[PDB]
Design a protein around this nucleic acid. Structure first.
Ligand SMILES: O=S([O-])[O-]
Lengths: 107, 92, 51
DNA sequence: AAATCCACCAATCAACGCCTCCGTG
DNA sequence: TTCACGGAGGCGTTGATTGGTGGAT
């Protein structure tokens, strides 16, 4: 129930749903064509295999979820029920995994 | 190259944030925009690493294995190993 | 200090982004969809409804 | 007190997924 | 020569984009 306890088992729950789910690669939360266009914005990228956008759709689903949950903990600590940009900035500072976003979310 | 192709659609991002939060929870427009920018950089950051290795090996195609390898190199190893299981199931 | 695994790729992306902005938020993206939404019948609470 | 701002709603049209065709290796 | 596979472009959908108000904060 606690925001922290949900996060601490986050990856166990990801692996459970991966290992025992009816994956319908048919449906995605994120459109594949748009994922592919983000990739193709890089002039260095030539061709992309059909699997790479599919992996990014699932990867980005997991990424948005992990970051939103980390950010929600900061919103909960400040007794707010609205998630703010400052909650995401606070979450990014707690793990060096997010160092790649230093220019996207400054200070 | 349309300038808006650097970013995933904000409604799709906003919906995934919604499912990750309690039912009563609300999300500021600035938090949705910020998340859109973060997840779009996540794709570009990992694709650039994969791309430079593809070029070094004179391969024209960025494939699924290149994305996973790039995720390990850049210290996203939970993502690389989770999506490896997801990939094997997609090919099963 | 910076994630040692991400350091080199961060700076390549900074240069690539600085280059991308060189060769290129608005209130809305599309004029047509903006006009659709300004045109439709609204309820009293400001919500859209079936035509 | 007075101000800020996000969920609510659903129809259009930008664009997504699928297909066929072709070029590459 | 055939096989594997991804881009280009056409077709039939199709859900992301969109803003005025109430009330939560
Ligand atoms: O040290 S890196 O963030 O430029």
């Amino acid at each position: 129930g606690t925001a922290r306890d949900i996060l601490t088992t986050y990856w166990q729950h990801i692996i459970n749903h991966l290992e025992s789910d009816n994956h319908d690669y048919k449906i995605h939360q994120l459109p594949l064509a748009r994922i592919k266009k983000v990739m193709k914005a890089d002039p260095e990228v030539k061709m992309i295999s059909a699997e790479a956008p599919i992996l990014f759709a699932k990867g980005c689903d997991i990424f948005i979820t992990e970051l939103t949950m980390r950010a929600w903990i900061h919103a909960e600590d400040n007794k707010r029920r609205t998630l703010q940009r400052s909650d995401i900035a606070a979450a990014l500072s707690k793990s060096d995994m997010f160092d790649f976003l230093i220019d996207i979310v400054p200070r | 190259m349309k300038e808006q192709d650097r970013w995933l659609p904000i409604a799709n991002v906003a919906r995934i944030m919604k499912l990750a939060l309690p039912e009563n929870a609300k999300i500021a427009k600035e938090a949705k925009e910020c998340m859109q920018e973060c997840v779009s950089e996540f794709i570009s950051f990992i694709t650039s690493e994969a791309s430079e290795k593809c070029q070094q090996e004179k391969r024209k195609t960025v494939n699924g294995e290149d994305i996973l390898f790039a995720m390990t190199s850049l210290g996203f190893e939970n993502y690389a190993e989770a999506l490896k299981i997801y990939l094997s199931k997609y090919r099963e | 200090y910076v994630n040692a695994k991400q350091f080199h790729r961060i700076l390549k992306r900074r240069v690539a982004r600085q280059k991308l902005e060189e060769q290129l938020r608005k209130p809305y993206l599309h004029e047509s969809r903006h006009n659709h939404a300004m045109r439709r019948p609204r309820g009293p609470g400001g919500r859209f409804l079936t035509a």
